[PDB]
Amino acid sequence: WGYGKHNGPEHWHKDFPIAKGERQSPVDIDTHTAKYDPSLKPLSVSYDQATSLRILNNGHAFNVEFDDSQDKAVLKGGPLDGTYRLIQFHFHWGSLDGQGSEHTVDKKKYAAELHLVHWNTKYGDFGKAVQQPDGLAVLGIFLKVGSAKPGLQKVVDVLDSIKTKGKSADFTNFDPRGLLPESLDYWTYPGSLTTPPLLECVTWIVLKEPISVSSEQVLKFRKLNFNGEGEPEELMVDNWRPAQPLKNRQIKASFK
Ligand SMILES: Cc1ccnc(S(N)(=O)=O)n1
Numbered sequence: 001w002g003y004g005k006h007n008g009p010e011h012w013h014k015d016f017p018i019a020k021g022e023r024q025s026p027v028d029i030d031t032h033t034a035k036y037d038p039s040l041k042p043l044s045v046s047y048d049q050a051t052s053l054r055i056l057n058n059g060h061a062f063n064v065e066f067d068d069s070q071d072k073a074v075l076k077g078g079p080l081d082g083t084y085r086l087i088q089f090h091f092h093w094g095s096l097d098g099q100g101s102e103h104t105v106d107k108k109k110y111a112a113e114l115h116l117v118h119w120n121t122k123y124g125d126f127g128k129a130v131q132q133p134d135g136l137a138v139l140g141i142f143l144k145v146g147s148a149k150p151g152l153q154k155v156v157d158v159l160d161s162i163k164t165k166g167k168s169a170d171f172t173n174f175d176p177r178g179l180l181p182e183s184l185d186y187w188t189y190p191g192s193l194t195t196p197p198l199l200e201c202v203t204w205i206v207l208k209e210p211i212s213v214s215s216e217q218v219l220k221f222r223k224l225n226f227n228g229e230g231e232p233e234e235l236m237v238d239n240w241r242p243a244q245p246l247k248n249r250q251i252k253a254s255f256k
Pocket residue numbers: 115117138192193194195196197198
């Protein structure tokens with residue numbers, strides 16, 4: 001599977017039939033249809049002890065991985081029951097500033113989207129968690145092109161060392177708090193992984209406020225490769241799944 005014409009999103013359902021399922025992601029967020037829930041708790045993002053380990057090009061995106069062997073970087077509150085531990089983040093982005101995000105907002109595409117992936121600690125580890133309907137919480141953050149995000153630069157600068165599929169590099173002491181916007185206002189809905197295996201295990205929490213990154217920063221994302229070392233170059237761009245049918249779901253807002 002990939003993002004090309006012959007193996008991309010419209011093909012995924014053949015190997016992964018859940019692609020046509022009842023709670024797939026991403027979705028368009030219609031901001032006028034979303035229901036304010038005065039009941040939803042504030043989101044709690046506690047990344048003060050987050051310990052990054054490694055950054056990896058997996059042929060689809062790049063992952064910054066975290067040591068999730070203790071409660072160190074956790075998400076709780078909001079729509080969530082219990083505690084979810086950060087395991088990794090990655091991005092989806094476009095070939096042009098006009099596209100790249102997976103979720104859309106009133107059909108607006110952003111230049112990219114950051115996914116901070118967390119697993120429910122009641123299931124003990126990530127592999128067991130993805131088999132559960134409430135196994136994961138993914139915090140999604142839109143990126144627009146404008147002013148630079150200083151806290152992103154350390155990620156940008158290491159991408160030259162992981163240009164091709166399979167390459168990884170040490171990436172310790174990275175603070176994901178530098179990737180967060182001011183506001184934690186959010187939309188939330190039940191959905192899925194947005195890449196194969198497309199498992200319907202995610203509580204999505206999508207922040208309303210985008211972060212700004214510079215054109216130069218996102219241009220460096222676009223220098224990555226889908227292919228491995230020594231292979232014909234295919235730029236890693238447009239690694240986003242388009243919006244899927246909302247079906248029997250309601251998107252809730254934490255704000256009015
Ligand atoms: C870890 C993982 C696998 C597949 N998809 C996702 S995503 N894009 O839904 O966050 N994350």
